Amino acid sequence: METVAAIKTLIQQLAQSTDQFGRAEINDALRELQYSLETPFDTVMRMSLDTCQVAVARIGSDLGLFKHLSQCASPQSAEELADHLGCGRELMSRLLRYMASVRMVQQTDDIKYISSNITQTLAVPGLEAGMRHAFENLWPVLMALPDFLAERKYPDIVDAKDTAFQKAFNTDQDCFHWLATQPTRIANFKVLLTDERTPNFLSTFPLEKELGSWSAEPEKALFVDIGGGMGHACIRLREKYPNQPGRVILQDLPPVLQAAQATLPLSGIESMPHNFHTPQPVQGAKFYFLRLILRDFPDHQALEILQNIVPAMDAESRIVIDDGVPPEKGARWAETGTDICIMSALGSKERTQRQWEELAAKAGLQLQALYQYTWPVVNAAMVFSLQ
Amino acid sequence: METVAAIKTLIQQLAQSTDQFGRAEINDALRELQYSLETPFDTVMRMSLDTCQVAVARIGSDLGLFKHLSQCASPQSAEELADHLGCGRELMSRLLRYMASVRMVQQTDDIKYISSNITQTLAVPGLEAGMRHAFENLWPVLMALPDFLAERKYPDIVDAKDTAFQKAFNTDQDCFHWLATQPTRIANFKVLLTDERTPNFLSTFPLEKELGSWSAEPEKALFVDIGGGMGHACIRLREKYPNQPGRVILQDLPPVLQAAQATLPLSGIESMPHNFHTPQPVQGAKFYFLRLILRDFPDHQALEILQNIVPAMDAESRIVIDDGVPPEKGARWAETGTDICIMSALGSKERTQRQWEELAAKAGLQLQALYQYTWPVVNAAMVFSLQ
Ligand SMILES: C[S@@+](CC[C@H](N)C(=O)[O-])C[C@H]1O[C@@H](n2cnc3c(N)ncnc32)[C@H](O)[C@@H]1O
Ligand SMILES: C[S@@+](CC[C@H](N)C(=O)[O-])C[C@H]1O[C@@H](n2cnc3c(N)ncnc32)[C@H](O)[C@@H]1O
Ligand SMILES: CSC[C@H]1O[C@@H](n2cnc3c(N)ncnc32)[C@H](O)[C@@H]1O
Ligand SMILES: CSC[C@H]1O[C@@H](n2cnc3c(N)ncnc32)[C@H](O)[C@@H]1O
């Protein structure tokens, strides 16, 4: 209709007028409008059928469909794609019709297919690995959660070894120990670590202000990236602040450090094997950095991780927790759905600012500053000192 | 910000101004805009987390939360709901924060909780049963589909006994036969049958034109509702055309007829046990009516269902197929996701108009008229005659 076409034009123009945070606000508003305007039948159909997207994306990934379509220079028929990818022709046609209906691909007026933005996204290895993680790891845990809670009379989940994960995968191990026995899941996780989120904390972190008159002499450490994965934070730090002296150290387990060597700069960033359940070896660093680490642990274990760092700190040292800080009320779906998932798989939780401060106070830490860098979903670098 | 509030105001006014079909078009446009404006990370987070809605709706149903909240006269704290419903207080608080973020409930400015439109929807028994069906029946089949297809080198699914269902539930039975052996699932399906879709075919079906000079004597049947469930079509027919002569007959299996007695009118509608895989007993009826029946069967079995009716027809008899008629191109998510689901569970498929005509021609039937009654997703009463 002319009205819906005009709605689309105006929302597209408003989205172009603003920045990425304004666009995120607009998208959340579109979701709220959808939910408020759907009929009861629509609500049930949406909940029933939006499930299809993850399974169908998993199939397209298995087939290599999104990568292939992303590199195509002209629209492709369903028969061409089926023959190229080794898929039944009718199966491929039905899959593509569904995918086009949810913009996973685009369907042309002559019933051929081209890449959409979502096609290109699912072709990126790290983002593809995120979707595959949702299918193979998250889905079974969420499928097990309702009956787990029912059988246990709805307990408050507090223990990584006693949550829905153990029911879903028929094991008594916690998720992290179980994963070490699953090579294909490990391989997918290694690809998942190559995804770099944007924006990052350096977009708003006032580094020179927080540094003050800290001296890197004689040979002190500026930045210790604890569980840093591929070291993206270290790389971006050296990129934005190339002249700031001090050691920059990536700490992780040996297999992921080995994976990180391929893309690490030739010099300037150390790779130090370190298990963050053991005392922090680097003494007196300016910043001990924990990005998306503590969210994966219940309070008692997250506390242990902080307690292992505290003895290494001097008066100028800071622990920087870079993580989600959802609000007391009005939290968005992308910071509450995470909470349900990490509850069900890891026994952990999202933490408000007050909850972060309580946890850190148990380690003897005090919040000095908080630097938000995403909106409306809150990710922030929280700077803690001793006392 | 102010912009988001203005978008909501204007879209709400436009939605109020139009009818249900215009609102459905607007909602589809809002979904398309959301998908087109999300970031790559947003896409993966959405696919990862929208899954949570079905699991959390199942938990809320298990707790009786939506029915309870729907009958509350004031906002309720999370502690009050937890204590009343027998749920851990922190678990209840986290569940409610997530539900509020996806409008499954509403959160007030003082962090209490009231019903939303979706709360009320999930409190309705038939719609609740739809959500429970999505969780317990659809989700396992979709979880099994990618590896089923991979192990079988991506076959065209054509057989109700050889699809993802058999892997999901570790059985050689087809879905309907297996479900008949599962009493709790049967009970849920009986509640699901009490949901009546709106609008229905009588909103556009020119009954008097199709009847012509047809005579109901001697004791002939006007309308035979084959697999009619609770008999809603019979009830609405008698309601809209109370003076039209001719028997009106609800045909289904005995347990469903028994369930239907509670809500059936005291006179005017016959309850006749009949299995639609067997020859049709009522001879020379004007309309043999099949609503949302044939979509659940692959072509050879749907053909058998029609062939069991054809010998009962005289020259004035018509078979009326009331079902989805998705377009050749540009089909919507609510008529393609259905296709993927019924492929994976039942071996069946959605059918375009041309595919319906091919199938019916195998039974000796010819399309006379097609009366659409929903938009933009196509449901239509297709009228077939002999020859
Ligand atoms: C969320 S991932 C990567 C987060 C990373 N800081 C980032 O934002 O780029 C968590 C990281 O913690 C690492 N890790 C898990 N257990 C660890 C342990 N016991 N000691 C050190 N690192 C660990 C993983 O190998 C992984 O690289
Ligand atoms: C989609 S449901 C209800 C459809 C119904 N026409 C309506 O629109 O409400 C399918 C119906 O077919 C019935 N059914 C399933 N197998 C049947 C059979 N073999 N013979 C007769 N009815 C059957 C079920 O009991 C159910 O009522
Ligand atoms: C976008 S990739 C991260 C997504 O997967 C979920 N997730 C990530 N890592 C884990 C993990 N180790 N265990 C359980 N869920 C996870 C998070 O809720 C998020 O939605
Ligand atoms: C509102 S319920 C409609 C849903 O029922 C689903 N469905 C799949 N198999 C069956 C079945 N055997 N019985 C009833 N509904 C089913 C379809 O996928 C559709 O999304």
Tab-separated table of C-alpha atoms in Angstrom, chain A residues 11-268:
chain	number	residue	atom	x	y	z
A	11	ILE	CA	11.529	5.630	9.008
A	12	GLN	CA	14.459	5.014	6.640
A	13	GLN	CA	15.084	8.757	6.402
A	14	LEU	CA	14.837	9.236	10.177
A	15	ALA	CA	17.259	6.336	10.648
A	16	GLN	CA	19.725	7.909	8.212
A	17	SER	CA	19.412	11.250	10.010
A	18	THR	CA	20.627	9.926	13.378
A	19	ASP	CA	23.600	7.888	14.631
A	20	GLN	CA	23.915	4.209	15.524
A	21	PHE	CA	22.435	4.737	18.991
A	22	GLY	CA	19.455	6.623	17.594
A	23	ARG	CA	18.966	3.795	15.108
A	24	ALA	CA	19.015	1.246	17.942
A	25	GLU	CA	16.330	3.270	19.743
A	26	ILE	CA	14.215	3.392	16.577
A	27	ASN	CA	14.538	-0.372	16.107
A	28	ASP	CA	13.443	-1.084	19.684
A	29	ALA	CA	10.462	1.216	19.097
A	30	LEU	CA	9.537	-0.701	15.938
A	31	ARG	CA	9.590	-3.946	17.929
A	32	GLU	CA	7.386	-2.480	20.676
A	33	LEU	CA	4.941	-1.213	18.034
A	34	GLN	CA	4.814	-4.634	16.384
A	35	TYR	CA	4.038	-6.347	19.690
A	36	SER	CA	1.396	-3.793	20.675
A	37	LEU	CA	-0.410	-3.906	17.307
A	38	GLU	CA	-0.407	-7.662	16.633
A	39	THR	CA	-3.580	-9.662	17.184
A	40	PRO	CA	-3.660	-12.462	19.789
A	41	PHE	CA	-3.424	-14.986	16.966
A	42	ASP	CA	-0.481	-13.015	15.545
A	43	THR	CA	1.279	-13.173	18.921
A	44	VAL	CA	1.046	-16.956	19.033
A	45	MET	CA	2.033	-17.322	15.373
A	46	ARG	CA	5.058	-15.064	15.884
A	47	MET	CA	6.236	-16.985	18.936
A	48	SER	CA	5.597	-20.274	17.099
A	49	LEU	CA	7.373	-19.366	13.870
A	50	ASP	CA	10.235	-17.015	14.740
A	51	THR	CA	11.900	-20.199	16.051
A	52	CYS	CA	12.348	-21.213	12.402
A	53	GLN	CA	14.946	-18.515	11.759
A	54	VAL	CA	17.748	-20.088	13.801
A	55	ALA	CA	17.193	-23.565	12.351
A	56	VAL	CA	17.043	-22.254	8.791
A	57	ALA	CA	20.132	-20.095	9.315
A	58	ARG	CA	21.888	-23.209	10.617
A	59	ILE	CA	20.895	-25.054	7.430
A	60	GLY	CA	22.059	-22.203	5.209
A	61	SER	CA	25.360	-22.161	7.097
A	62	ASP	CA	25.771	-25.931	6.685
A	63	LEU	CA	25.179	-25.502	2.940
A	64	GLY	CA	27.486	-22.498	2.564
A	65	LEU	CA	24.522	-20.626	1.082
A	66	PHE	CA	25.122	-17.218	2.657
A	67	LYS	CA	28.794	-17.028	1.683
A	68	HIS	CA	28.009	-18.147	-1.878
A	69	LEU	CA	25.103	-15.734	-2.326
A	70	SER	CA	27.180	-12.936	-0.802
A	71	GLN	CA	29.782	-13.344	-3.537
A	72	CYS	CA	27.256	-13.576	-6.424
A	73	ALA	CA	27.208	-10.759	-8.982
A	74	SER	CA	23.670	-11.363	-10.321
A	75	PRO	CA	20.367	-12.754	-9.010
A	76	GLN	CA	20.340	-16.549	-8.773
A	77	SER	CA	17.427	-18.905	-9.327
A	78	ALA	CA	16.551	-21.504	-6.708
A	79	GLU	CA	17.560	-24.214	-9.184
A	80	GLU	CA	20.986	-22.637	-9.729
A	81	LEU	CA	21.615	-22.372	-5.977
A	82	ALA	CA	20.363	-25.912	-5.323
A	83	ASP	CA	22.579	-27.405	-8.023
A	84	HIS	CA	25.631	-25.398	-6.951
A	85	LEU	CA	25.248	-26.209	-3.242
A	86	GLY	CA	24.146	-29.848	-3.479
A	87	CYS	CA	20.629	-29.350	-2.141
A	88	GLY	CA	17.345	-30.849	-3.267
A	89	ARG	CA	15.649	-28.413	-5.631
A	90	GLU	CA	12.275	-28.333	-3.879
A	91	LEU	CA	13.915	-28.113	-0.451
A	92	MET	CA	16.087	-25.241	-1.683
A	93	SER	CA	13.109	-23.402	-3.189
A	94	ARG	CA	11.085	-23.660	0.034
A	95	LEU	CA	14.058	-22.651	2.193
A	96	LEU	CA	14.703	-19.604	-0.009
A	97	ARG	CA	11.044	-18.541	0.046
A	98	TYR	CA	11.073	-18.633	3.839
A	99	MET	CA	14.437	-16.861	4.033
A	100	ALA	CA	13.201	-14.101	1.733
A	101	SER	CA	10.108	-13.682	3.889
A	102	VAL	CA	12.356	-12.904	6.881
A	103	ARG	CA	14.951	-10.927	4.827
A	104	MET	CA	17.632	-13.609	5.319
A	105	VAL	CA	17.897	-13.234	1.540
A	106	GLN	CA	16.057	-10.992	-0.921
A	107	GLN	CA	13.648	-12.313	-3.565
A	108	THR	CA	13.480	-10.420	-6.864
A	109	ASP	CA	10.384	-9.713	-8.954
A	110	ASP	CA	11.330	-12.615	-11.259
A	111	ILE	CA	11.627	-15.041	-8.297
A	112	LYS	CA	15.420	-15.053	-8.134
A	113	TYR	CA	17.562	-14.401	-5.073
A	114	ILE	CA	20.206	-11.864	-4.035
A	115	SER	CA	22.058	-11.068	-0.815
A	116	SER	CA	20.491	-8.901	1.881
A	117	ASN	CA	22.293	-7.242	4.782
A	118	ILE	CA	21.505	-10.384	6.788
A	119	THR	CA	22.993	-12.645	4.095
A	120	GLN	CA	26.254	-10.706	4.352
A	121	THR	CA	26.161	-10.897	8.152
A	122	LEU	CA	25.710	-14.669	8.183
A	123	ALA	CA	28.633	-14.959	5.737
A	124	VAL	CA	31.062	-13.392	8.260
A	125	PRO	CA	32.817	-16.253	10.143
A	126	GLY	CA	32.580	-14.787	13.666
A	127	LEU	CA	28.923	-13.791	13.311
A	128	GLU	CA	28.059	-17.110	11.658
A	129	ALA	CA	29.709	-18.746	14.663
A	130	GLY	CA	27.484	-16.708	16.979
A	131	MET	CA	24.382	-18.038	15.238
A	132	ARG	CA	25.760	-21.592	15.316
A	133	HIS	CA	26.429	-21.162	19.043
A	134	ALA	CA	22.802	-20.119	19.540
A	135	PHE	CA	21.637	-23.276	17.747
A	136	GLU	CA	23.950	-25.888	19.259
A	137	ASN	CA	24.548	-24.528	22.789
A	138	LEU	CA	21.759	-22.093	23.727
A	139	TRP	CA	18.771	-23.880	22.189
A	140	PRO	CA	19.119	-27.156	24.169
A	141	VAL	CA	19.516	-25.284	27.454
A	142	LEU	CA	16.437	-23.148	26.834
A	143	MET	CA	14.495	-26.261	25.778
A	144	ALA	CA	15.454	-27.885	29.095
A	145	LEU	CA	14.797	-24.861	31.334
A	146	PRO	CA	10.990	-25.069	31.851
A	147	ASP	CA	10.960	-28.703	32.972
A	148	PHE	CA	14.166	-28.227	34.973
A	149	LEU	CA	12.463	-25.435	36.925
A	150	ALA	CA	9.218	-27.402	37.278
A	151	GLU	CA	10.926	-30.546	38.608
A	152	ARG	CA	12.908	-28.471	41.118
A	153	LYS	CA	9.951	-26.338	42.308
A	154	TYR	CA	11.350	-23.124	40.797
A	155	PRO	CA	14.606	-22.529	42.693
A	156	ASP	CA	16.774	-19.463	42.568
A	157	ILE	CA	19.678	-20.659	40.406
A	158	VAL	CA	23.032	-19.801	41.985
A	159	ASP	CA	25.388	-22.642	41.010
A	160	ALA	CA	27.111	-23.258	37.663
A	161	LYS	CA	27.026	-27.007	38.371
A	162	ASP	CA	23.251	-27.086	39.122
A	163	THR	CA	21.295	-25.368	36.357
A	164	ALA	CA	19.478	-26.262	33.138
A	165	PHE	CA	22.739	-27.022	31.300
A	166	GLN	CA	23.271	-30.268	33.238
A	167	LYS	CA	19.804	-31.486	32.270
A	168	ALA	CA	20.152	-30.387	28.641
A	169	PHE	CA	23.451	-32.184	28.073
A	170	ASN	CA	23.047	-35.052	30.580
A	171	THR	CA	26.249	-34.264	32.469
A	172	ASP	CA	27.292	-33.256	35.973
A	173	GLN	CA	30.084	-30.969	34.724
A	174	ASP	CA	29.666	-27.230	34.516
A	175	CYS	CA	29.434	-25.723	31.046
A	176	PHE	CA	33.083	-24.664	30.835
A	177	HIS	CA	34.490	-28.060	31.856
A	178	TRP	CA	32.054	-29.926	29.590
A	179	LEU	CA	32.989	-27.797	26.564
A	180	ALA	CA	36.623	-28.955	26.757
A	181	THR	CA	35.392	-32.444	25.785
A	182	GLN	CA	33.560	-31.228	22.642
A	183	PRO	CA	35.999	-30.503	19.787
A	184	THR	CA	33.497	-29.167	17.224
A	185	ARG	CA	32.001	-26.779	19.775
A	186	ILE	CA	35.531	-25.674	20.690
A	187	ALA	CA	36.298	-25.010	17.024
A	188	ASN	CA	33.153	-22.920	16.642
A	189	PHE	CA	34.025	-20.977	19.803
A	190	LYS	CA	37.496	-20.278	18.415
A	191	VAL	CA	35.845	-18.729	15.365
A	192	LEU	CA	33.401	-16.840	17.612
A	193	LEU	CA	36.336	-15.166	19.374
A	194	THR	CA	37.342	-13.491	16.106
A	195	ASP	CA	34.194	-11.349	16.149
A	196	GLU	CA	35.066	-7.876	17.409
A	197	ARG	CA	32.188	-5.876	18.852
A	198	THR	CA	31.790	-2.241	17.845
A	199	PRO	CA	31.828	0.316	19.310
A	200	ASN	CA	34.334	-0.408	22.091
A	201	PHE	CA	35.186	1.285	25.379
A	202	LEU	CA	37.952	3.432	23.868
A	203	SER	CA	35.277	5.499	22.112
A	204	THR	CA	34.420	7.136	25.468
A	205	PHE	CA	37.149	6.066	27.930
A	206	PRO	CA	39.131	9.210	28.960
A	207	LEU	CA	42.447	7.383	29.030
A	208	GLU	CA	44.723	10.360	29.697
A	209	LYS	CA	42.420	11.560	32.481
A	210	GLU	CA	42.412	8.134	34.149
A	211	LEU	CA	46.172	7.800	33.663
A	212	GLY	CA	46.912	11.037	35.483
A	213	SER	CA	50.617	11.243	36.231
A	214	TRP	CA	51.161	7.470	36.251
A	215	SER	CA	54.703	6.731	35.111
A	216	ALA	CA	55.595	3.732	32.985
A	217	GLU	CA	59.153	3.956	34.330
A	218	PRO	CA	61.150	1.970	34.975
A	219	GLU	CA	59.309	-0.838	33.141
A	220	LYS	CA	55.714	-0.917	34.386
A	221	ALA	CA	52.583	-2.361	32.765
A	222	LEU	CA	49.938	-0.051	31.294
A	223	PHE	CA	47.243	-2.580	30.381
A	224	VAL	CA	46.679	-6.230	31.336
A	225	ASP	CA	43.852	-7.792	29.279
A	226	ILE	CA	42.646	-10.647	31.494
A	227	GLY	CA	40.884	-13.273	29.408
A	228	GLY	CA	41.459	-11.041	26.396
A	229	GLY	CA	40.747	-13.658	23.739
A	230	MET	CA	42.205	-12.504	20.423
A	231	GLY	CA	43.476	-9.337	22.116
A	232	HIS	CA	41.212	-6.863	20.302
A	233	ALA	CA	41.263	-4.509	23.298
A	234	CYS	CA	45.077	-4.499	23.325
A	235	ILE	CA	45.210	-3.915	19.560
A	236	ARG	CA	42.738	-1.030	19.687
A	237	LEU	CA	44.525	0.478	22.694
A	238	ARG	CA	47.885	0.553	20.917
A	239	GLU	CA	46.158	1.832	17.771
A	240	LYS	CA	44.408	4.761	19.450
A	241	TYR	CA	47.242	5.583	21.900
A	242	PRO	CA	50.433	4.674	20.015
A	243	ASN	CA	52.704	6.926	22.091
A	244	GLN	CA	51.572	5.990	25.611
A	245	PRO	CA	54.382	3.983	27.268
A	246	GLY	CA	53.944	0.858	29.335
A	247	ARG	CA	53.614	-2.871	28.756
A	248	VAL	CA	50.432	-4.085	27.067
A	249	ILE	CA	49.801	-7.717	27.962
A	250	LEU	CA	47.247	-10.192	26.601
A	251	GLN	CA	46.421	-12.911	29.147
A	252	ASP	CA	44.435	-16.032	28.221
A	253	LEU	CA	44.810	-19.804	28.046
A	254	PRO	CA	47.514	-21.255	25.747
A	255	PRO	CA	45.200	-22.524	22.962
A	256	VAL	CA	43.500	-19.172	22.457
A	257	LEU	CA	46.803	-17.249	22.739
A	258	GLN	CA	48.139	-19.533	20.010
A	259	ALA	CA	45.045	-18.758	17.932
A	260	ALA	CA	45.615	-15.032	18.563
A	261	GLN	CA	49.238	-15.002	17.355
A	262	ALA	CA	48.183	-14.923	13.685
A	263	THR	CA	46.523	-11.495	13.981
A	264	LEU	CA	48.521	-9.898	16.799
A	265	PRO	CA	50.922	-7.059	15.957
A	266	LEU	CA	54.533	-8.089	15.494
A	267	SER	CA	55.639	-6.083	18.539
A	268	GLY	CA	54.188	-4.082	21.396
